[PDB]
Amino acid sequence: PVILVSEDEYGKFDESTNSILVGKMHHLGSRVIEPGDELIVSGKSFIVSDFSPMYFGRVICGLRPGMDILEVGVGSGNMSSYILYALNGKGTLTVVERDEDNLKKAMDNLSEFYDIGNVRTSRSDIADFISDQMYDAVIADIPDPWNHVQKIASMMKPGSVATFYLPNFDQSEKTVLSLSASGMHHLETVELMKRRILVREGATRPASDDLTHTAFITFAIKKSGMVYRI
């Protein structure tokens, strides 16, 4: 554990000495601090995290081989494809998808380009999904994540990150409001807008090409449940 994260300021943690640097410095008195632990220093909450490249710019998502990733809602399989490429045959992907046909289509598409021997699927609603495993990351693209945050939280390793994709502001806001009661800590939510440009002047094109496409992406960290105050 080296990073202290929050919805605004970030800091650094040294576990050998239990020191907190957020600028100014503090120390904890000698239990072992773990990822997901909450450190409240002068009334402000920080969550202990291992380093991840998403935090690099704040202290000066992160897919890597070996992770066990949970994907709730598959879509076209496009996200699954990026996940498998990054895993590079090491680690596993678990896909929970309520729609049987969408699931089959996605897996058929993926199997054309990837060995899917490290992929497991559950054709079920996330509410009914039962897993004994804890995941290193959760990626969620479902209609109503606010109704499944406690469930999703229960299968996240402490200090791990969940990414939620929502199509509009109102759903994004409802999702964020649901986070604290689940044992997750909101990091940030972004509106991302993409549009393709510099298409051949006057060319006939797919209608989509001139559209701006918008995603609302919420990141949250799983808390261990342990709180220290200094």
Annotated binding site: 97, 125, 141
Q: What is the largest CA-CA distance in the chain?
A: 69
Q: Which stretch binds its own copies (CB under 8 A): 23-31, 34-42, 72-80, 119-127?
A: 72-80
- Establish if 107 lies at the interface with its own copies (CB under 8 A): no
Task: Go through the chain and list every residue after which a break occurs, taking a C to next N gap over 2.5 angstroms, comma-separated.
Answer: 22, 29, 60
Bridge partner residues of 4 (DSSP):
11, 48
- Establish if 198 lies at the interface with its own copies (CB under 8 A): yes
Q: How far is the CB of 31 from its own copies (least distance, A)?
A: 25
Q: How far is the CB of 129 from its own copies (least distance, A)?
A: 25
Q: How far is the CB of 218 from its own copies (least distance, A)?
A: 8
Residue numbering of the annotated binding site for S-adenosyl-L-methionine: 97, 125, 141
- Establish if 168 lies at the interface with its own copies (CB under 8 A): no
> In the window 25-54, what residues touch its own copies (CB under 8 A)?
51-53
CB atoms within 10 A of CB 141: 18
**CA 220, CA 162: separation in Å to the nearest integer?**
5
- Establish if 189 lies at the interface with its own copies (CB under 8 A): yes
**CA 173, CA 178: separation in Å to the nearest integer?**
9
When the beta carbons of 57 and 117 are compared against its own copies, the nearer one is: 57
Query: 33 Cβ partners below 8 Å, 6+ apart?
Result: 1, 13, 15, 18, 39, 48, 228
Burial readout 195-211 (b: 16 or more C-beta within 10 A, e: otherwise): eeeeeeeeeeeeeeeee
Which residue in 93, 67, 98 sits closest to 81, CA to CA? Answer: 93
- Establish if 160 lies at the interface with its own copies (CB under 8 A): no
Interacting residue with its own copies among 22, 28, 48, 63 (CB under 8 A): 63
- Establish if 207 lies at the interface with its own copies (CB under 8 A): no
CB atoms within 10 A of CB 26: 14
Which residues are near its own copies by CB under 8 A? 2, 7-8, 51-53, 56-57, 60, 62-66, 76-78, 81-82, 85-86, 88, 109, 112-113, 169, 172-173, 176, 186, 188-200, 203, 205, 216
